[PDB]
Design a protein around this ligand. Structure first.
Ligand SMILES: [Zn+2]
Lengths: 45, 958, 50, 959
């Protein structure tokens, strides 16, 4: 049932989220980029 | 340009280069592995499987209607057909550029809407390539019988394997299918008044359940069921038509499969769906097999493969890996010996692996197969060269961005010229494209990568004593004698070049060996079985053979037209590094060939499985070369082909030669006397029914058991149709309703007829197969093609002796090769725009390749041609660099540029050195590139620092 | 919500045919199947056009 | 900009341009030749063929439900269908962009009676018509030669989808029954045929062993000859009732083939292989004095087309170079500025080579050449005159008006990709070729050219009239405004078409004959028709196709003929007669052959006309309605009306009248009182009378039908039919007229349903006058009648073509003027924009000059003219506005007076390149002459207003 797609979607997010959390890490280049990158959890709250 | 700003991005550009490298490895992960590319072109056969009929009745009533309704399909290139014992088999092969499913569509459009008499249903063969047979297996068991093994095969194994995605079908050979045989004694047949057809139209009837729809009772609706279905044999024996034996049985056998001391067993062939990836599917069929052996099949019955494609895959991965490893190792070691410093050595060394990932990602994202054959032939020592110069400057300069931006422009130039020469490899199509194109792709990509690395990272990364002035002496060491050596050596390349072989493939060793074994005409399945058994006896004598499997006759699909007189033999081997003997490879083939000539009635042709497939789908027959003998009369064409067979057998180049079509077999021809049957009240139909059912034994109906299905067949009893007299004794039923032996109204005689009729585009021919072993193609075909067409008795009905095989293959290949090769010359001439001498620095390497080829007795095949492409590609860079640095101007650069030149000429001609080593499956193709490149580079380098600077002081001053 | 998808086994009036009887009575099971499919079931015979 | 590096890159740009030269020559050597572009739309028809059956038991239950399911096929555009004796054939034409095999696949899916799919060919795929000639051989022998040698051979030519036979005689085996010995014999035609059919088989007994050998068993019962059949009446060889008859020069009964070009394959390319095949047939295969000889051969047309276009482009070339030579004075400069033409052409082939664009000769003939060099000759003029060291100091002065002027002529040439269908297929390769070559002219004039380093009285005459511009505001704007409406009411009177005649090699005829006519009488009428057609010195061969062929892709009766009329080369026309005048001489002549109604068209275009509208004519009028009688009544009205209008030439009702049929109904109660099945009767009619084939005898690779049928004069008339007998349940003969109404009843011959509507078609040709005014008049006169309603009436054919073309013109026009003004912004622009009517004047006075109309071709012509005209305006206004920016009035003779030569030069080369294209003498110039006329005429009256009213306009506006 919908659990096939549930698992597919959620696991996919468990795959392609460090895809950008490492991409933004490199992109942000003014050490400090980590600090700027910590804006994520604060929003998650 | 960007060399300026990339320096201040050191960390950043390094970081992304790590990230890229990650995506590099990832790109390599989702990359299709080909150990042996799909060499075959786009083909498709149409199969008409009539059960019990003979050749004359099959060609005229099916092959002629089909060929009539087919010849104009949008896509055709070659069209062939073979008509045989109850089989119209029409092979079509399309032009280069036609999609499989598209082609199968057009074809299937043209084959349906027909009308085939004996209930014949023209279907299509499964979508597969010659090289698609990936998993050959057999069912072993100490305790169970062949009927049970056959049942397992049909109802469990083949179904399960069919569930594997990428498997288009599973081809069965051997065993015993189960019929419900009904033995009619003809004595009480025309005694109870009604004859065969009355029965076979009655027993065909009472076996079809009835549904009565809904019957209502109260508020319920019960569906009505009538169970009138013949189940077991007792439900069969008790059937009536008016007021004989009944047993399990089998149809006459299409084939018999044999093995190691095992006369009668059963095999399956896993047919890979076209384009799908072998190893990927292999995982699936492996899991399926394990699931069968461990769970589905009864314990004590095991599926045991004897040919598996993943074996060759492992051998290939091993060998190629070994080649790349030894390559990079040697390149790094010479880097160490020539630089001294391990730090810089490693700095230039990492240009190699990093570029690979940069090449992989481009191949991955834009649909390119990871072809292992066109990868082991990679040089490495060519890649680093750019970076190498970026080192040679800096290291020999003691900011650094200035020397790198200095040497940058003469590297982008060198980049193009070396990445250009590889472009002609994209020209040739067909089977020489699926094998060499990914190499050129990977090289170009790894050159984009090598350039980017050399110019945007390398700068950022922050006994010879006798060799030095000895060179300073010969420099000082006469314009006439110089150009004399130049021209003389040039004619050296011309002479030694004009005198060399011209193959097409360097054999390409697979794990095993395939045999086209040929037995005497019109023999019985039993006799053929004995003979095959003895052949396997003869084969197992050699210790090098692992398993030997025979296929006599044909599989039950109809995708082969083979008679019981034909055998195909699989011969597997032990690992090459395991043979407790001294035999080579061609020595093993020659030994087996000698032994096989000692057995009577057995002619044996040698080839390999996948290549037997593609050779067949190409030529029309299973041999390297074939000689077609067109003609409308059989006897004539057979005579001509006899002459051509002896003629070709003569030449000391053709190791095997024989006519492909079996001779006219005998046959008991039952003609029907018209005027007599008229004068006696008998119908031809009745006779035909007696033959087809009473003698032939057509299946009446079909019985179901669970998920299984069997054929109820009716046929005259044992010891009744044994011979012409007996058959003539069989009776019918006139209008008088009694007895008339067919001997009264039918002429039953012993005639002969053709076994197989190989129609070629409605131009009947007769194939003369020939395999060559030793002599090349040019030296062979010279004498051969010379002799043949000038010793044949013209002309009559056609009789134009044509050729086929790797002949027109090699011809078209070389044709396109020399079509695109001179085109790249002007391309790499406008680049050099002075350019004349650098362009003339090309045939220097030619003789260098020729000496190494002549040394190793090789030939000028497509492989070695590609070798000369890489060679001509890189050997000009040395000229460019020994010109940019460069009448006393010689020592302004020569003595200075001598060190990196050797360094580049060392690393390049050292990566292909381990790829110049034989042994192990997967090196056969790559080797002739190494033999050309290394040997070419050694002499061409040993000369470029001698005659070229002595040619630069002879310009615009004379 | 929760339910078994497949409907339970429904009753059927099953007309099996005794072979040995129709044998010792001279009758074909095809006749019976036609009796049911047509006589009981009621198969369409032809196609009328207006 | 990039002239800088280029000036120091002379040798390099020269070498690379040489490279593009070589790859350009190579690109042209790998380009498909198309002389008559595949005008057709994506269509496919389904054939449900029922042999020997009449015309109402074929539509009631066959065409209708098929039409129901098939109507829902994706990509469907127009759905037509026709039902009749023999068959139901349903035509489906699709929307544009619908790929062939895809469509045929959807169709094939939906149709899954035995409905089949017709061969995949265009209505212009019939590329090689031929006939088997001999002096000694008989039509049956020629028929077998056709069937088993010629067609099987030509079917091997790659690109040939199928071959269509017409004429000759298929051979069958037949016994000629005499029911006299069927009377008291109680064997029916069905038992006779089931018997005679079931005993034709060759069983095999599989493998019978004998020691170590295993021999196959062969039973042989296949019938071989009528000898083996003979074991009553006369059993003989014979032939089925004749399909149609084909006739030629005095030959009434021969046999022909039609080579069908597979869809989307190159005609000449396939013609090569066909030529190989045909040659092989004559040389080595066929018996001597049996020669396959063509009468239509597409190769001829390709020849005449490449000759016409070749002559055109050559003449244009030499004329343009003549202009350059006469102008510059220096042959050196003339050559170095001329070599832009071959350079750009080679530089345009490559871009067409990689975009896979074909080489339409019809549209490549219409290239101006002298409009390509205008990007280059202005520079040369500005250097070899204005300048009189540093070359690219002068190339910068006229640079901006050139880059922007040429991007303007490109953006103007651009919106030809708007329209679709036929008006696109015809004029599309030109748009691309011109685009690419234009960008090449740009890339040459400001690159390779900088690397290269009676007029006397014309000079001050110009100075005088420019001094007349000093003042006269209301007079200048007077001329402008007055001529604006002066051309607005000149193109308001112009006639409007859709395309010119487009002359092919020959002439096709849809010849209509009296209803119900036998095949013999039809044959005689055709004989006469053809003997009257040969009464001209200009007719090479005349071929008639009366009736039907073998396949069934035509539902034709003997009353229907299609005629092919081949001509002599126009070069050798002794009789002083124009082709159109030949056509009217033919029409007049044909109005003196009794019963012979003749439709006039052409072999290629007739097909697409039919697939488009419905019937084989330029125009049709469809009268819809579910009643046969009334729709035919109204159709009689519309016919009689339309045939009175002076524009309509031929007019007929496509659907042939109802015909008598001897009809045998069966009496139920009678055969219920005599114990007889209707199936016995139908068997009697289908086998006995009808003569249905019973079985199939094989001889070598050939095969023939074995047929059983009653002898002649046993089915002679309705009496004789009614008089033959058939047995009953009482075991005794029963006469047929005892249980069956054998009578004579009128039935419909052909039922045509389009878009699920029963309609009748009044087909008619526009030949004689105009299209716009004509259709206006006639269609207006149609509204008088139409006696409603119980019935709708529509127009079709090139009417829809005109509509789509016009609508597309109205769509395109403001689209370009948007960007054109946008590009002309900054570098006020309205001043330059209003140069289009200046060119429009000549473009319309030239149409009235030679006697023409306003077709899509001439429209594209105006699209072209606007470019060069606005280029001249741009150059003028730019050099003016830059020269200056009364003291300002001085600039009107200074900044404009010195632009005399560049403007005149451009306006000359661009107007002499199309003069040869304004020639008609030859096949392939029948579409170029519109653009040629529009540009040539519209440029020689545009410059005179660019150099006079325009400077006065600039001086008047900027104050
Ligand atoms: Zn095989």
């Amino acid at each position: 049932g919908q659990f096939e797609n549930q698992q597919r979607a959620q696991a996919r997010l468990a795959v392609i989220l460090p895809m950008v959390l490492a991409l933004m890490f490199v992109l942000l280049f003014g050490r400090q980029p980590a600090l700027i990158l910590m804006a994520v959890p604060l929003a998650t709250l | 340009r960007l060399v300026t700003l990339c320096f201040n991005r050191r960390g950043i550009v390094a970081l992304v280069f790590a990230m890229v490298a990650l995506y590099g490895w990832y790109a390599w992960k989702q990359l299709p592995l080909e150990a042996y590319p799909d060499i075959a072109d786009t083909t498709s056969q149409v199969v008409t499987q009539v059960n019990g009929l003979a050749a004359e009745e099959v060609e005229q009533q099916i092959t002629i209607p089909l060929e009539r309704e087919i010849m104009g399909v949008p896509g055709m290139h070659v069209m062939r057909s073979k008509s045989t014992f109850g089989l119209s088999l029409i092979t079509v092969v399309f032009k280069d550029g036609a999609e499989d499913y598209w082609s199968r569509q057009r074809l299937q459009e043209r084959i349906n809407g027909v009308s085939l008499p004996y209930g014949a249903q023209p279907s299509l063969d499964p979508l597969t390539s010659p090289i698609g047979e990936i998993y050959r297996y057999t069912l072993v068991s100490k305790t169970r019988d062949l009927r049970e093994l056959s049942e397992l095969q049909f109802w469990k194994v083949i179904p399960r394997l069919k569930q594997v995605a990428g498997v288009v079908d599973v081809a069965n050979f051997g065993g015993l299918t189960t019929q419900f045989m009904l033995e009619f004694d003809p004595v009480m047949l025309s005694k109870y008044n009604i004859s065969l057809n009355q029965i076979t139209q009655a027993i065909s009837e009472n076996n079809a359940n009835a549904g009565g729809s809904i019957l209502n009772r109260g508020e319920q609706g019960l569906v009505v069921r009538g169970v009138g279905l013949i189940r077991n044999l007792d439900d069969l024996g008790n059937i009536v038509v008016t007021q004989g034996r009944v047993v399990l049985g089998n149809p006459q056998r299409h084939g018999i499969l044999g093995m190691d001391r095992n006369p009668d067993t059963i095999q399956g062939i896993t047919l890979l769906l076209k384009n799908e990836n072998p190893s990927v599917v292999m995982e699936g069929v492996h899991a399926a097999v394990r699931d069968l052996n461990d769970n589905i099949l009864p314990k004590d019955v095991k599926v045991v493969p004897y040919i598996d494609r993943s074996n060759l895959v492992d051998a290939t991965v091993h060998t190629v890996g070994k080649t790349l490893m030894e390559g990079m190792f040697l390149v790094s070691l010479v880097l160490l010996l020539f630089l001294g410093s391990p730090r810089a050595a490693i700095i230039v060394a990492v240009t190699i692996p990093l570029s690979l990932l940069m090449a992989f990602i481009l191949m991955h994202h834009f649909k390119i197969p990871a072809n292992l054959l066109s990868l082991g032939a990679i040089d490495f020592g060519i890649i680093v060269d750019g970076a190498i110069v970026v080192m040679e400057n800096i290291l020999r300069r003691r900011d650094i961005m200035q020397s790198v931006l200095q040497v940058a422009r003469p590297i982008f130039f060198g980049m193009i010229v070396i990445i250009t020469a590889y472009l002609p490899l994209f020209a040739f199509q067909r089977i020489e494209y699926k094998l060499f194109s990914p190499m050129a792709f990977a090289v170009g990509f790894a050159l984009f990568g090598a350039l980017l690395v050399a110019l945007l990272l390398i700068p950022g990364l922050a006994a010879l004593v006798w060799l030095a002035p000895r060179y300073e002496s010969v420099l000082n060491r006469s314009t006439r004698t110089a150009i004399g050596i130049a021209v003389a050596t040039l004619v050296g390349v011309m002479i030694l070049g004009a005198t060399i072989g011209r193959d097409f493939l360097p054999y390409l060793d697979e794990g095993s060996i395939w045999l086209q074994v040929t037995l005497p005409p019109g023999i019985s399945l039993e006799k053929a079985g004995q003979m095959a058994d003895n052949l396997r006896a003869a084969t197992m004598e050699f210790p090098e053979v692992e398993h030997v499997v025979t296929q006599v006759g044909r599989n039950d699909e109809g995708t082969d037209p083979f008679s019981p007189s034909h055998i195909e033999t699989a011969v597997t081997l032990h690992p090459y590094s395991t043979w407790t003997s001294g035999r080579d490879k061609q020595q093993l083939i020659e030994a087996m060939a000698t032994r096989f000539r000692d057995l009577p009635g057995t002619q044996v042709g040698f080839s390999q499985p996948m290549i037997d497939g593609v050779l067949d789908k190409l030529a029309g027959a299973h041999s390297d070369l074939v000689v077609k003998v067109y003609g409308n009369d059989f006897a004539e064409t057979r005579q001509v082909a006899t002459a051509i067979t002896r003629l070709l057998k003569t030449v000391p180049g053709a190791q095997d030669v024989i006519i492909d079509q079996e001779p006219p077999l005998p046959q008991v021809r039952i003609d029907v006397d018209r005027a007599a049957a008229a004068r006696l009240g008998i119908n031809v139909a009745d006779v035909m029914a007696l033959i087809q059912t009473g003698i032939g034994g057509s299946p009446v109906t079909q019985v179901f058991v669970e998920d299984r299905s069997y054929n109820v067949v009716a046929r005259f009893i044992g010891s009744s149709r044994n011979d012409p007299e007996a058959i003539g004794n069989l009776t019918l039923t006139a209008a008088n309703g009694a007895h008339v032996a067919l001997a009264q109204v039918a002429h039953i005689r012993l005639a002969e007829g053709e076994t197989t009729i190989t129609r070629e585009m409605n131009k009947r021919h007769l194939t003369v197969r020939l395999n060559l072993r030793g002599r090349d193609l040019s030296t062979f075909l010279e004498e051969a093609r010379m002799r043949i067409d000038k010793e044949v008795p013209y002309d009559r009905t056609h009789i134009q002796v044509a050729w086929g095989g790797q002949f027109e293959n090699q011809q078209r290949a070389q044709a396109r090769l020399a079509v695109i090769l001179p085109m790249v010359l002007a391309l790499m001439f406008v680049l050099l725009f002075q350019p004349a001498l650098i362009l003339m620095a090309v045939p220097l390497a030619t003789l260098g390749g020729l000496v190494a080829l002549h040394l190793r007795g090789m030939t000028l095949n497509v492989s070695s041609a590609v070798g000369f492409i890489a060679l001509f590609g890189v050997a000009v860079l040395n000229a460019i660099i020994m010109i940019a640095n460069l009448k006393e101007a010689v020592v302004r650069g020569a003595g200075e540029r001598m060190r990196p030149v050797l360094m580049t000429a060392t690393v390049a001609a050292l990566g292909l050195i381990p790829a110049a080593l034989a042994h192990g499956l997967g090196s056969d193709v790559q080797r002739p590139l190494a033999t050309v490149v290394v040997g070419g580079l050694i002499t061409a380098t040993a000369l470029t620092l001698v005659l070229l600077p002595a040619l630069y002081y002879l310009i615009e001053t004379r």
